[PDB]
Enzyme design. Structure first.
Site, PDB file in Angstrom:
ATOM      1  N   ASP A 155       9.759  41.288  -0.438  1.00 27.55           N
ATOM      2  CA  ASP A 155       8.448  41.511   0.134  1.00 27.55           C
ATOM      3  C   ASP A 155       8.014  42.967  -0.058  1.00 27.55           C
ATOM      4  O   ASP A 155       8.838  43.840  -0.339  1.00 27.55           O
ATOM      5  CB  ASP A 155       8.472  41.170   1.624  1.00 27.55           C
ATOM      6  CG  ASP A 155       7.126  40.740   2.136  1.00 27.55           C
ATOM      7  OD1 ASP A 155       6.187  40.686   1.316  1.00 27.55           O
ATOM      8  OD2 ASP A 155       7.011  40.454   3.353  1.00 27.55           O
TER       9      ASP A 155
ATOM     10  N   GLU B 231       4.025  47.582  -2.542  1.00 29.25           N
ATOM     11  CA  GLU B 231       2.773  47.975  -3.163  1.00 29.25           C
ATOM     12  C   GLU B 231       2.173  49.314  -2.678  1.00 29.25           C
ATOM     13  O   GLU B 231       1.624  50.064  -3.487  1.00 29.25           O
ATOM     14  CB  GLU B 231       1.731  46.840  -3.067  1.00 29.25           C
ATOM     15  CG  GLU B 231       1.559  46.184  -1.713  1.00 29.25           C
ATOM     16  CD  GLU B 231       2.690  45.225  -1.352  1.00 29.25           C
ATOM     17  OE1 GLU B 231       2.874  44.202  -2.049  1.00 29.25           O
ATOM     18  OE2 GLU B 231       3.398  45.501  -0.369  1.00 29.25           O
TER      19      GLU B 231
ATOM     20  N   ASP C  79      -0.129  36.727   1.803  1.00 31.09           N
ATOM     21  CA  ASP C  79      -0.650  36.317   3.115  1.00 31.09           C
ATOM     22  C   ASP C  79      -2.040  35.669   3.188  1.00 31.09           C
ATOM     23  O   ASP C  79      -3.033  36.337   3.495  1.00 31.09           O
ATOM     24  CB  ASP C  79      -0.611  37.518   4.070  1.00 31.09           C
ATOM     25  CG  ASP C  79       0.752  38.180   4.114  1.00 31.09           C
ATOM     26  OD1 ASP C  79       1.708  37.593   3.565  1.00 31.09           O
ATOM     27  OD2 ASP C  79       0.880  39.278   4.699  1.00 31.09           O
TER      28      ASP C  79
END
Ligand code: XYF
Lengths: 773, 773, 260
Positions: free
Chosen positions: A416, A419, A482
C-alpha cells in the site's frame, strides 16, 4: 502547462525558441544527428550569435524510434532513470538527402524536412501517422519563475483518440484533458492517480513514451485541440514513438521495451477476502469469516490481514499486535492447513511511536532533509518517516523483516501507499528528488517482489500494489485503490482498470463492494459479478466487512455462482494470462484494443473484453437494465446460450445472477471440471465448447500447464458441412460440446450424447470429425 | 478552479465552509427560503459564532427551478445582468415537512433533506436527475490571494455526458475538461472561444444556466470525475436547472428563458461572397469579380465588403476610403440592381489615425481607465480605443453612422471582434468591469440589430457575428471565425458549430476553405459541400484570391452543384429555420439531439442532422473515404437514391461532387423549382418526395411562406398497400415522387409518370390515393 | 510570546495542537511514558491521520520531576546542554491505574488523568501545588514565519507570586511581566539582563527550570493572568518541577541539581 495564449499570443513571461531550419545532418554509427537553428542561417552572417538545437534519432528496439532534443548539454542530469531495455545493435536505415534526413527502424521512420520549411514527420511504410509541425516543439524560458522547459506537440488526425497515461479515473478517452504524471494519494474520484505512466497510444496504431520520471505535463487536445502537447522542466526532451499498427502490437513493443507483466501463480486468481480496514478483528474474527464461508459453500482461496495486524501508530515496524494476535505463526499455519493463501498489509513509511523508529533513525535508514534531520509529517501516522530505499542497508533491513513474515507462512504482500514522496529532501544516493517521487513506487515494489522471488520462488510471487511507475508492471496485480460503494464509483473504477491495461499493466483488481461507505445490497450484487469476471478478485472494505451475508441471502448466491464460474473458466483465463506475460496484452481489454478497426468502439468504457473471446458488460442499475455494443459476428451468451447479431448496440435487463457475458463466434473455449478452486490440473476432464464455427474458419484452443506453457492444443476447422477436429499434446478424458447444435448427421471416431447446451461429443481414436445436418 | 486536492485534501491556502444542516425553512409568496448552517446548530449554544447560508428557490418559467445560495448580502453586486425573461406568477408548489422541504415547478422540483443528512436533490416527477451532495457546494475563502468564491457540484450518473458551454473547439463531449466562460480572440484551434455561454446540458434530458456574466470556471468531470463543478468570484451563486426531458425540450425552455433565435430572411440563406481580407480593390475590381461568378453560372446573392472599405489604421470611423470608393451609394445601388444584397464589415474599436478618434475622445464616447485617460493598446490596431456602449450618447453616435450606411443601401453588417474587453476600466454607467467583459458582445450586437430593426425592418434583419454572450442568440447567424486550411481544422470547426446549437443558437455560418493558410484543392472542395449544407454559407478567406477556378475547374462545379442544391432545398430548409425561431431547435443538430435514446449517438461529432429529416456526413479525407453512423431505419441518399439500413456504421468513398446526405424513412420532403436563388415562391411547382413510408405510418410536409408560417401542408398516410395523400392550404402545379417506387398497382384522382428516382404522381381532386403492388 | 488572542481567539497564522486524551501509558524502568492524542482516538477509525504527543516523566534527583513533551524526534537537537547533575538510580514510584497515570519522586508526583477529561497535575503529598489544564500546552505552528514552538502553562493559585528568572531589575514579583531568557548588555535600568536563568519559584514552595539554553519566552501572568506560560522554538519541551516545600528547600534542590 499552458504555453500559448490562444492561437495568436503567448503566456505572459514566456520566451520561446524553436528549431525552424536544419543546419546540418550527421550520421554517427547507427544514430542520426540533426542540428537545427532557431532562425534562417543559410547566410554565414547569421551562423553565429544564435541557439542551436541538437536532435538525435536512435532505436532501442525494432519499431521504436527515439527522439532526443537538447538545448544545453552541460546540465547535471542526475538519475534515477526509467528501467528501459536498450539494445545497441538494432538494424536501422539512415538516409540523408538533399530534401530530407530520414531515420528508420523496421516500418517506422522519422523524417526531417531540410531547407526553408522545417518539418518532423513520423512515417509507417511511407505514410505519416503523426509528427511535429514547425514551432510546435522547442525550449521555454519562464521569466516569471526562472524555470526552463522543453516541449513537443505531436499531431492527431480527424477522429484520432488518445488513451492511457496510467490508471486514471477521468473519461477513458484523454482528448480534452490535462494530465500530470505525478503519483498522488487522491482516491479514485478525481483527476489524480496513484499510478502515473507518461505513455499514451491512439486508435491510429502507435504510442509514445516520454522518457522522464519527473512530472511530465500533458495537454491532450487541451491547449491546441488537434495535438498532444507534453512538457518537462529539463534542458532536454526525450520521447519514443512506438509503432503498431495495432494497439496490441504497440503494447507488445512497449512492454518488451519497459517490462513484461510477470505471470501470477494460479492460486492468486481465486477469491480474496479481507478483515477490512478499520473494522475490528482478531483470530476469532478471522475464523468466524472463514468458517462462515465454508458453511455457506462459498469457495475462498486467499485471506488478507489489513493494517491492524500491527499496533496502531506504529504502522509498519512489522510487529504483530500481541493483544490481538498472541500467536501469529500458529494462526497462520492453521489457515494454510485449510488450503488458504495468506497476504498481509505493508507500506514504506513508519510511525514514530514504534520502538523500531529510534533504531532506524540512529542507523540513518530513514529519508533525511538537506540539513541532515529526518523528513517527517503527521499525515497517515504521527511523526511519520519514510524508508530510504536508495540506502543499501535500509533495503536489507526492510527485506529481512519481510523474510521474517514469509518464514512465518505469509505468501504475499499488499504494497500500500508509496505515492506521497517529498522533494524537499536528500536521498542517500544523491538521486534527483524530482525523479525519485514517481520512481519510488517502482523501487519499493521491486524490493518486495525480490524478497518473494528469493524465498517462495518467482513462480509463486504476486503482490497487491496501489502505486506504480514505468516498469512496475513486472510485479503483477495492482488494484484500483480507495473507491466508494455506489454505481458511479464502480464505473469510474472500470475506466481506471481499462486505462491501466492501455498502459502496459496486465493484471488489475478492485475492492468488490467499494472501499468507502457500505453499499446497498443491489450494488454489492452487481459489483460481485464485475469483480469475479476480472483477472483478480477481492472482497475488501474500509469501515464495514465484505462477507456476502452482511448484505443479504441472495448476495451469497451471487458470490457462489460467479466464484464457481471463475474457477471453471481458469483453463481459458490462465491462457489469456500467459498472453499478458508474453505480449503485454492485458487480461481486461478496452473494446478499441480488441477491435481496433471498429468505429463504434472508440469511446466504449462500460464494457470490456476478458481475454480474446468473451465480452463482459457489468450492470450499473438497480433495475438491471444495461446497454452494450457488440462488434461484428454472432455472439453467444456464455451460459444462457442465447445469440446476438453484432456490429450494433443491444439493450437487456438482467437479474442478480446474470449480466451480458458473450462469446465471439469461431471460438473454441476450454472450461474446467472444478468449480471450487482456480488451481487444478486443467487438461484433465476438460470440457471444450465450440461456438458458431463458420464455414471456412478454424477455431483454436490452447490449454496451459500450471507454468503457462501450452500443454495441449485443440483445433476445429470446418470445410463444408464437415468440421475436422484434431488435438496435439497431453489431455485426459475431455469432451467437445457443439453449442446450440441439437442433432448431428454423422460422427467418425466418437460417441455423441445430447445436452441442454448442445450435442456433446466423446473422442474415440484420432479423427473425431463430424458432419453437420 | 481547483478546490479539492484529491479525495482527501483541500488546495493549500483555501478555507471551506458548506451548508451542512437545515436550520429553518420559510415560505415567502411563491418562493422557498432555506437557512443552512455549516455545522450542527440544534443546540442554542452553537447558534452563535458561525456562518449561515441563505438558499432561495424560485421559478422564472415553468420547468425551470432557480437556486440562489448566498453568504454575505452586503456586497456591491453591480450590473450588468443577463437578459432573462422572468415571470412572477408561475404556478409552483412549496412543501415544508418534517423530513424534507421541496420546491416544484412543472415536473421539476428541488428538494432539501432536513436532519443529520443534508442533501440537495433535483427531481423529475419524483425521480432524481441530478443534485448536490453534502459538502459539494458552499463558500471558498482563498487565503493566498484574498479572493472569495461560491461553488456548486451537480452530479453526473453512469454514462452521463455533458455538452454546450458556447462555441468551443475541444472534444464535443465536455466530460474531462475545464472551461472558463470568458470571451477571447484565440482563433478556432484551442480551448479559447469567441462565444462563451455558462449553459450546459446532458444526455439525461436537463440543462443548467449558471447566472453569472463574469467568468465562470467549470471543471466538467475534471476535478471530481462524477460531477460538474462550477465556481465564481462572488458572495452568492445562482444557477437554474432547466427540465427537458429531451434535449430539444431543454433548449425550448432555455431559449424561451434567455431569448429566441430570430428568423433570418430567406435571402440570407443564399451563398455569401467575400473577396478575402488582404486583397487590393476598388469598384471596378468588385464588379469584375461579381461578373466572374455570373459568367460561370455560379449563383451569388450576398456580397460582403470586408476591412478595407475604410482607410487603413482608421478602422471603424465609418468613412469610405475616398480614393478607392469615390462614390459609395452609387456603387452599392449599382451592385444592388444586379440582384445582390450588401453586407459591410464593422467592429467596436477605432484607431488613433482616424480624424474621428479625437472627436469621440473629446465627447467622452470611448472607454476610459479609472484616471480618466483613454484605455488603449496596439494589438490589431495602433492606439486602439473602445466605444463605450454603456454611454447613451456614444450608442446614438454609432447607431446614426450605421443608419447612414443602411440609407446608402447596405443590408446587413458583420459585427467582428468584441471579445477582448479590458477590466481595468471605468464604464460610463459604472457597470462591473468583470461582468462587462462578456456582456459587451451582447450590448454591441443588440445595438446593431436594433438599427436594422428600425430601418430595413425586423424581418430583413440579419448579421454575421463573431462574438456572443447569453441572450445574443436573438441576433441570428453567428460566424465560426478564423479557421485553418486542413481537415483537422475543418472538423474542429464542425464541433464548434454543433456546440453553439447545443448552447441556444439556431443559426451558424462558417467560411468555405477557411480563413488563414493556403488550402489544397481537395480540402477546398470537401469544405464547399460542408459549407453549403449549413444554415449559412460564405465563400471567403484572407490571402488567396476568392476564385474557385483559380484552383481547377472541378472546384467550380462543386461550388455550383451544392449552391443549386441548397436553393432547391429551401422549402425544407426555411421550414426548419422557423423551428429554430419557435423552439430554439438549431438547424445543424448533433446526433445526440435528434436521437437522444440511441446510445450510438453520444459522441458523434463528424456528422450532423440538417433539420429533422436529413443526415450529412462531410468527407474529411483526400481519397474521399468516410465512415458515418446511421440511426434506426432505412435511409435513402437524397439524390443518389441508394438506401442503407440503420442502427449501424457505414464506410463509403465519395468523389468531390458527393458526400453522405441521407434522408429518413417515413419522410415527405419538399423541393423547390428554382436552383438559382433561395428566396422564391416555394409553394408553386413544388416537388414533393416520399421516402420509404412504412405500413401504418404517416409523413407530413409543411411548406412555409416568406414569414415562416406554414402555407401548405401535405400528408401521406399508409394503411396497408393504400397510401392516402391529402393536402391543406395554398399550393400550385405541385408533384409527388415515390422514391424507389417504379410500378404501382392503382391510383385515384391523379395521373402518373415514370422517373429515375421513382414514380411521379400529379394530383387532381386531392382524393389522390395510391395503392402499391 | 503571544499564543492566544484573548480568551476566545488565537493569534493569526498560528495553528495549535494539544494533548487532549491519553492513548497509552508505558513504564520504562524508572521512567513513565504517556502517549496523548490531540483528539478522541478511542475508535480505530481515528487512530490514523493525526499527530501524537509523547510525554516522558523521570527524576534526575530526589524531589525533582522531569517532564518532557515531544512532537517530532527527527530534529537535530545539537548541544550544548545545561550542566545538569542527573542521577540514574533515583527511587521513584510509578502507578498506572485505570483512572490515572502517576509518577512520584520524593513527596512530589506528576499525575495525568485518563479518559474524557485530560489534566496534568503536580502533587505534594497527594495535594495539587500546580499543573497544566487541558489545552494549556502543546505545539505551535507559526505560519507567519514558518517557525514551530512547544509551550506549557503552569497554574498559579490565588495570592501565588512568582520570583527569579535571573538577575532582573524590573519589579521583584514577576506577576504581570514578559521575560525572555536571553543575555544582553543593556544596563541595569531596563527589562534586559546580563544574567538570565530560565528558573522561577513561587511563594507556594516549588520551583521549575525550563531545560533550554536557547531563548525561552516567559509570560508570567501576562497572557493568561493565572498561569506562567513558557515557550521555546523546539520540537520538544522539557522542564523540571522542584519540590520545596520552602523557598530555601527549593533552592537546595535546585543548586544540588545545577551546581553549588
Ligand atoms: C491502503 O490504505 C488502507 F490501509 C487500506 O485499507 C486500503 O485498501 C489501501 O488503499
Amino acid at each position: 502547462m499552458k504555453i500559448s495564449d490562444g492561437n495568436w499570443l503567448i503566456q505572459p513571461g514566456l520566451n520561446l525558441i524553436h528549431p525552424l531550419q536544419v543546419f546540418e545532418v550527421e550520421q554517427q554509427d547507427n544514430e542520426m544527428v540533426v542540428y537545427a537553428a532557431p532562425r534562417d542561417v543559410r547566410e554565414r552572417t547569421w551562423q553565429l550569435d544564435t541557439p542551436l538545437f541538437t536532435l538525435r534519432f536512435f532505436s532501442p528496439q525494432e519499431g521504436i524510434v527515439g527522439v532526443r532534443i537538447e538545448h544545453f548539454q552541460g546540465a547535471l542530469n542526475n538519475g534515477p532513470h526509467y528501467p528501459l531495455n536498450i539494445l545497441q545493435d538494432v538494424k536501422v536505415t539512415i538516409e540523408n538527402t538533399e530534401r530530407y534526413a530520414e531515420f528508420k527502424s523496421g516500418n517506422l521512420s522519422a523524417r526531417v524536412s531540410k531547407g526553408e520549411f522545417w518539418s518532423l514527420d513520423f512515417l509507417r511504410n511511407g505514410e505519416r501517422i503523426t509528427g511535429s509541425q514547425v514551432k510546435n516543439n522547442g525550449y521555454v524560458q519562464d521569466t516569471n519563475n526562472q524555470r526552463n522547459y522543453m516541449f513537443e506537440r505531436l499531431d492527431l488526425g480527424v477522429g484520432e483518440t488518445v488513451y492511457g497515461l496510467g490508471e486514471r479515473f477521468t473519461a477513458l478517452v484523454r482528448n480534452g484533458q490535462t494530465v500530470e504524471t505525478w503519483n498522488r494519494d487522491g482516491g479514485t474520484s478525481t483527476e489524480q492517480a496513484y499510478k502515473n505512466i507518461p505513455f499514451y497510444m491512439t486508435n491510429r496504431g502507435y504510442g509514445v513514451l516520454v522518457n522522464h520520471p519527473q512530472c511530465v505535463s500533458f495537454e491532450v487536445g487541451s491547449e491546441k485541440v488537434s495535438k498532444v502537447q507534453f512538457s518537462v522542466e529539463s534542458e532536454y526532451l526525450e520521447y519514443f514513438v512506438i509503432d503498431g499498427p495495432t494497439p496490441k502490437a504497440v503494447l507488445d513493443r512497449y512492454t518488451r521495451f519497459t517490462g513484461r507483466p510477470a505471470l501470477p501463480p494460479a492460486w492468486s486468481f481465486g477469491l480474496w477476502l479481507t478483515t477490512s480496514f478499520t473494522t475490528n478483528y482478531d483470530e476469532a474474527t478471522v475464523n468466524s469469516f472463514i468458517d462462515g464461508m465454508a458453511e455457506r459453500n462459498l469457495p475462498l482461496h486467499v485471506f488478507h490481514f489489513d493494517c491492524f495486524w500491527m499496533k496502531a501508530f506504529q504502522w509498519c515496524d512489522f510487529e504483530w499486535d500481541p493483544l490481538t494476535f498472541p500467536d501469529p505463526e500458529g494462526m497462520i499455519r492453521r489457515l494454510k492447513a485449510k488450503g488458504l493463501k495468506i497476504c498481509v498489509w505493508i507500506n514504506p513509511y513508519i510511525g514514530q511511536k514504534s520502538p523500531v523508529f529510534k533504531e532506524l533513525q540512529e542507523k540513518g535508514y530513514l529519508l533525511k532533509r538537506p540539513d541532515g534531520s529526518l523528513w517527517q509529517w503527521d499525515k497517515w501516522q504521527p511523526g511519520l518517516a519514510i524508508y530510504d530505499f536508495t540506502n543499501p542497508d535500509a533495503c536489507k533491513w526492510y527485506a529481512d523483516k519481510l523474510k521474517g513474515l514469509v518464514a512465518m507462512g505469509v505468501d504475499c504482500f499488499k504494497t500500500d501507499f508509496g505515492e506521497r514522496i517529498p522533494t524537499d529532501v536528500q536521498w542517500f544516493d544523491g538521486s534527483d528528488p524530482q525523479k525519485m517521487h514517481n520512481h519510488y513506487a517502482y523501487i519499493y515494489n521491486e524490493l518486495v517482489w525480490n524478497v518473494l522471488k528469493d524465498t517462495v520462488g518467482e513462480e509463486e510471487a504476486v503482490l497487491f500494489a496501489r502505486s506504480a511507475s514505468v516498469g512496475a508492471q513486472k510485479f503483477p496485480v495492482h488494484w484500483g485503490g480507495d473507491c466508494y460503494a455506489n454505481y458511479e464509483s464502480m464505473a469510474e473504477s472500470l475506466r481506471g482498470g481499462l486505462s491501466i491495461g492501455l498502459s502496459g499493466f496486465g493484471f488489475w483488481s478492485h475492492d468488490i463492494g467499494g472501499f468507502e461507505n457500505t453499499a446497498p445490497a443491489h450494488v454489492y450484487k452487481r459489483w460481485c459479478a464485475f469483480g469475479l469476471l476480472s483477472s483478480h478478485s477481492r472482497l475488501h472494505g474500509s469501515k464495514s466487512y465484505r462477507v456476502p451475508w452482511a448484505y443479504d441471502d441472495e448476495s451469497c448466491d451471487v458470490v457462489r455462482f460467479f466464484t464457481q464460474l471463475k474457477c471453471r473458466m481458469m483453463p481459458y483465463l490462465y491462457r489469456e494470462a500467459a498472453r499478458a506475460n508474453a505480449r503485454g496484452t492485458p487480461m481486461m481489454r478496452a473494446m478499441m484494443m480488441e477491435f481496433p478497426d471498429d468505429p463504434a468502439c472508440d469511446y466504449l468504457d462500460r464494457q470490456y473484453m476478458l481475454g480474446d473471446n468473451v465480452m463482459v458488460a457489468p450492470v450499473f442499475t438497480e433495475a438491471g437494465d444495461v446497454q452494450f455494443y457488440l462488434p461484428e459476428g454472432r455472439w453467444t451468451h456464455l451460459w444462457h446460450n442465447d445469440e446476438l447479431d453484432g456490429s450494433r448496440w443491444h439493450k437487456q435487463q438482467h437479474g442478480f445472477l446474470s449480466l451480458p457475458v458473450y462469446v465471439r463466434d469461431n471460438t473454441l473455449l476450454a472450461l474446467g471440471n472444478n468449480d471450487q478452486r482456480p488451481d487444478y490440473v486443467w487438461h484433465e476432464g476438460t470440457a471444450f465448447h465450440l461456438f458458431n464455427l463458420q464455414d471456412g474458419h478454424e477455431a483454436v484452443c490452447e490449454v496451459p500447464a500450471a507454468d503457462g506453457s501450452v500443454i495441449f492444443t485443440l483445433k476445429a476447422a470446418r470445410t463444408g458441412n464437415t468440421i475436422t477436429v484434431t488435438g496435439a499434446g497431453e489431455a485426459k478424458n475431455w469432451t467437445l460440446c457443439l453449442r446450440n447444435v441439437v442433432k448431428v448427421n454423422g460422427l467418425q471416431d466418437g460417441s455423441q450424447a445430447e445436452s441442454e447446451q448442445g450435442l456433446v461429443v466423446k473422442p474415440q481414436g484420432n479423427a473425431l470429425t463430424i458432419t453437420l445436418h
